[PDB]
Amino acid sequence: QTVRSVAGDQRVTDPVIVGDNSILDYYGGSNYDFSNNFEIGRGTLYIGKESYFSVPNSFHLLIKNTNNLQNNGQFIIENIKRHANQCSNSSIQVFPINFQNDGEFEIISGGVEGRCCLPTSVIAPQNFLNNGKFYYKVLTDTGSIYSGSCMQNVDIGASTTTTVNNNLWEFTGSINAQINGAVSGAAQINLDGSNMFVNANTFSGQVVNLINGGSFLQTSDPLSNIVVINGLGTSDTGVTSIAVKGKGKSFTYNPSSGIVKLTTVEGKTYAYQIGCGYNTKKFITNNDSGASADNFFVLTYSEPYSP
Ligand SMILES: [Gd]
Ligand SMILES: [Gd]
Ligand SMILES: [Gd]
Ligand SMILES: [Gd]
Ligand SMILES: [Gd]
Ligand SMILES: [Gd]
Ligand SMILES: [Gd]
Ligand SMILES: [Gd]
Ligand SMILES: [Gd]
Ligand SMILES: [Gd]
Ligand SMILES: [Gd]
Ligand SMILES: [Gd]
Ligand SMILES: [Gd]
Ligand SMILES: [Gd]
Ligand SMILES: [Gd]
Ligand SMILES: [Gd]
Ligand SMILES: [Gd]
Ligand SMILES: [Gd]
Ligand SMILES: [Gd]
Ligand SMILES: [Gd]
Ligand SMILES: [Gd]
Ligand SMILES: [Gd]
Ligand SMILES: [Gd]
Ligand SMILES: [Gd]
Ligand SMILES: [Gd]
Ligand SMILES: [Gd]
Ligand SMILES: [Gd]
Ligand SMILES: [Gd]
Ligand SMILES: [Gd]
Ligand SMILES: [Gd]
């Protein structure tokens, strides 16, 4: 049992080592820069605005030139705007070469009441391997889920990075998760009120679960694979949706396979496994036309989701 609790800005060039039953609490700094390896055992590494045990305007975390980030415990990044309401260039940038997450990796932002001013967030290790739980949550000052109009944009992966999910991702609240790199494995992605944008050409082995008005959007051309998407439906906790880039010509649902196909006027056909027991007559289809894809063909279903 060792607690370390360190206040103020940090430029850390030494290895970060958290032993079993230990806590390392970095807080109260506006600037954090780590450049060496991380080894987190059965303990907690916390980097945040306020102490793990509970004020600058800004929060900047950079992990860059780190060879290996090995997480076997809890790795928390927390940036809640409390009293503060100034708009700053707050950022979370996680670019280690190797990130192996066997435990819990949890990013928490939000607390925006007035001006819509959220941090830049990019999680793009060259090699990001998740065997554990990756959480991104947007919370109020009290720690409730934030579901307002100020959307936290999160970039996951990049054009040349490799991302593997073998367990769980869960994005909760007003989050736009832009999947900008190759993702593979065999895992669940839980979208609890959040949107996920499949921008890449490899997005494989991921079962997507839409909860509380969560949405799946693809901007890339149709994949080889048929993504399993659970939760299409309309309830009091909202309307979940599947959307593809372009202008929709038609849809077909096969009640015998549980596969829906969305065909665009360009003749691109997107296929998703939504499950059995849908009624064709209760599907709704809309072309959205505006501003990343200008246009989306949006599939919804008028009745509650039944597993
Ligand atoms: Gd040193
Ligand atoms: Gd030991
Ligand atoms: Gd040791
Ligand atoms: Gd140990
Ligand atoms: Gd030990
Ligand atoms: Gd040991
Ligand atoms: Gd500072
Ligand atoms: Gd070790
Ligand atoms: Gd060791
Ligand atoms: Gd060890
Ligand atoms: Gd150990
Ligand atoms: Gd906190
Ligand atoms: Gd936790
Ligand atoms: Gd706040
Ligand atoms: Gd506040
Ligand atoms: Gd594991
Ligand atoms: Gd927990
Ligand atoms: Gd947690
Ligand atoms: Gd927790
Ligand atoms: Gd973005
Ligand atoms: Gd962007
Ligand atoms: Gd969950
Ligand atoms: Gd790709
Ligand atoms: Gd797949
Ligand atoms: Gd939405
Ligand atoms: Gd109702
Ligand atoms: Gd189109
Ligand atoms: Gd086109
Ligand atoms: Gd629109
Ligand atoms: Gd964008």
User: How much distance in Å is there from the Cα of 157 to the middle of ligand 24?
Assistant: 18
For residues 138, 141, 147 and 150, what is the CA-based torsion angle, rounded to 10 degrees?
-80
If you search the block for the tokens 């928490």, which residue do you land on?
A: 108
Question: In the structure encoding, which two tokens stand for residue 96, read together?
Answer: 């280690």
Q: Give the separation between CA 78 and CA 139, rounded to whole angstroms.
A: 10
Tell me the CA–centroid distance for residue 149 and ligand 26, in Å.
22
Which ligand is closest in space to the CA of residue 135?
18
The two tokens of residue 120 are 């830049």
* Ligand of minimum distance to the alpha carbon of 72: 16
Q: How was this structure determined?
A: X-ray
Which residues make up the environment of ion ligand 16, defined by Cβ < 5 Å?
102, 131
Q: How far is CA 307 from CA 60, 258, 276, in A?
A: 42, 12, 9
Euclidean distance between CA atoms 164 and 100, whole angstroms: 10
Resolution in A: 2.0
The answer to whether the beta carbons of residues 101 and 130 sit under 8 Å apart is yes
| Coil vs helix vs strand at 285 | strand
Which residue from 296, 297, 298, 302 is spatially nearest to 282, judged by alpha carbons? 302
| CB neighbourhood size of 263 (10 A) | 19
Of the bound ligands, which one is closest to the alpha carbon of residue 111?
14
Q: What pairing do the DSSP bridges indicate for beta strands 16-18 and 3-12?
A: unpaired
* 37 Cα–ligand 26 center, Å: 51
**Cα 37 to Cα 125: distance, rounded to the nearest angstrom:** 13
The domain spans of the chain are 233-307
Q: What b/e string do you get for 27-64 counting C-beta neighbours within 10 Å, with b at 16 or more?
A: bbbeebbbebbbebeebbbbbbbeebeeeeebbbbbbe
Ligand 30 mean position to 75 CA, how many Å? Answer: 28
What separation in Å is there between the alpha carbon of 103 and the centre of ligand 16? 7
The CA 60 to ligand 10 mean position distance, Å, reads 29
